[PDB]
């Protein structure tokens, strides 16, 4: 039962599910070329993908879905989930993106790739906004799980798929309750609780925009197949 958990239990599951922080390929030729930077970043994302699937299976409600729909959700969300992880890692490094512990890149180093400096500016801006809002890890892991579930749910049809959508909205309602509980426990007024909830959820639309602009720039210079995701889930 996924919809049985209390708000306090839900936070433990999400924090226990959290994937590890990984390193980039140790000691590349620095400084980077456009080819070598895209090599290291690609190397990192593909290794992070494996821990995202293991994370995804531990997110309450996800394993209850069919395998086909689990792939669909991850196929829509995987870049947004990498991006918010980056933005979260970066928080306490103003003007810098912490891709890995050994790969802290400032704004000016995005220039190497060309077109990329646009994407860096957007990722940095999101991290500034999180620093402005004083985003907490309990709130952060809740927003990641909302991205995983929400960002592919609209494209689903029979009585099976109707229940599958309804189930997802029920878990999304559960994660909303869990976000508000944390804000109430922290001692914000109801007016502030609602105001903060809205501000957090409106940042997910900017993350989607960053994801799309990111996908376009990646095709400008591969993207994860249905078979790779299914293989990683069952095995």
Decide if residue 49 touches ligand G8Y (CB under 6 A). Answer: yes
Contacted by 214, from a copy of itself, ligand G8Y, none: CB < 5 to 8 Å by type: ligand G8Y
Smaller CB separation from a copy of itself, 13 or 204 = 204
Burial classification of residue 43, based on how many CB atoms lie within 10 Å of its CB (0-12 exposed, 13-18 middle, 19 or more buried): middle
Decide if residue 85 touches ligand G8Y (CB under 6 A). Answer: yes
Q: Which candidate, 68, 83, 62, 63, places its Cα nearest to that of 144?
A: 83
Work out how close the CB of 213 gets to ligand G8Y at its nearest, in angstroms, rounded to a whole number: 8
Decide if residue 42 touches ligand G8Y (CB under 6 A). Answer: yes
Distance CA 146, CA 143 (A): 5
Segment contacting ligand G8Y by CB under 6 A, of 50-58, 77-85, 152-160, 169-177: 77-85
Rounded to 5 degrees, what angle do the CA atoms 50, 56, 58 make?
115
Segment contacting ligand G8Y by CB under 6 A, of 6-14, 79-87, 159-167, 192-200: 79-87
Q: Which candidate, 126, 99, 95, 122, places its Cα nearest to that of 108?
A: 95
Distance CA 191, CA 178 (A): 17
Work out how close the CB of 95 gets to a copy of itself at its nearest, in angstroms, rounded to a whole number: 12
Rounded to 5 degrees, what angle do the CA atoms 20, 25, 28 make?
150
Q: How many CA atoms lie within 13 A of 68 on its CB side?
A: 5
Contacted by 181, from ligand G8Y, a copy of itself, none: CB < 5 to 8 Å by type: none
Decide if residue 232 touches ligand G8Y (CB under 6 A). Answer: no
Binding residues for a copy of itself, per CB under 8 A?
121-122, 125-126, 129, 146, 150-151, 154-155, 169, 172-173, 176-177, 180, 190-191, 193-195, 197-199, 201-202, 204-209, 212-213, 216
């Amino acid at each position: 039962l996924a919809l049985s958990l209390t708000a306090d239990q839900m936070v433990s599951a999400l924090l226990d599910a959290e994937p590890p922080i990984l390193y980039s390929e140790y000691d590349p030729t620095r400084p980077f070329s456009e080819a070598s930077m895209m090599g290291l970043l690609t190397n990192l994302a593909d290794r992070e993908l494996v821990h995202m699937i293991n994370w995804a299976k531990r997110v309450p409600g996800f394993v209850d879905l069919t395998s086909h729909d689990q792939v669909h959700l991850l196929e829509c969300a995987w870049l947004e989930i990498l991006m918010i992880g980056l933005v979260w890692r970066s928080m306490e490094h103003p003007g810098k993106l912490l891709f890995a512990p050994n790969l802290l890149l400032d704004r000016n180093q995005g220039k190497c790739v060309e077109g990329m400096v646009e994407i860096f500016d957007m990722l940095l801006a999101t991290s500034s906004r999180f620093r402005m809002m004083n985003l907490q890890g309990e709130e952060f892991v809740c927003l990641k799980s909302i991205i995983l579930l929400n960002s592919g749910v609209y494209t689903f049809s029979t009585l099976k798929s109707l229940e599958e959508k309804d189930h997802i909205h029920r878990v999304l309602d559960k994660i909303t309750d869990t976000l508000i509980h944390l804000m109430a426990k922290a001692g914000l007024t109801l007016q502030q609780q609602h105001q903060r909830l809205a501000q957090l959820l409106l940042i997910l639309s900017h993350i989607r925009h960053m994801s799309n602009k990111g996908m376009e720039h990646l095709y400008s210079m591969v993207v994860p197949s249905y078979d790779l995701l299914l293989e990683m889930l069952d095995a």
